[PDB]
Nucleic acid binder design. Structure first.
Ligand SMILES: [Tl+]
Ligand SMILES: [Tl+]
Ligand SMILES: [Tl+]
Ligand SMILES: [Tl+]
Lengths: 66, 66
DNA sequence: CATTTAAGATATCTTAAATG
DNA sequence: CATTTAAGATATCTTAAATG
């Protein structure tokens, strides 16, 4: 089963931006992005919603996929 | 001005259910519900989404008011 | 260079006791 | 009774160092 982190990374790669660039858009460090993408952690409520807008997708898609 | 916890409590009061009943719907303790309502903590990503569904509103409404 | 690892501060949860 | 407070375990961040 596909993890949220893999969905985050795939979406970021489609947008052709670095982790630091996505972090700037969300309001977190590049390391936070790395942690989410590798499923070390999951974004908190505020960060998940900011991340979903930066990635142009729904929070539900990130959390649970299709 | 208005805090997310105030919006959570107002939405729960609209449903007329107890914190424990809401916690059961969301997947957390009554105590987590209390901590969110008192703005002591904020829900994580997964919990924010579950809460918004339980309360029949959007995650953005809870987070920022609309 | 871009990203991951590491250490550490603090937030987010838990169950039990206290409160009203 | 419902809710809050207390104590405590794990999760979520940060910056600095390590990696390739
Ligand atoms: Tl750590
Ligand atoms: Tl009492
Ligand atoms: Tl490293
Ligand atoms: Tl190197």
């Amino acid at each position: 089963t596909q993890l949220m982190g893999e969905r985050i990374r795939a979406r970021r790669k489609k947008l052709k931006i670095r982790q630091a660039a996505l972090g700037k858009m969300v309001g977190v460090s590049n390391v936070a992005i790395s942690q989410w993408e590798r499923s070390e952690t999951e974004p908190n409520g505020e960060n998940l919603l900011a991340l979903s807008k930066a990635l142009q997708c729904s929070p539900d898609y990130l959390l649970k996929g299709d």
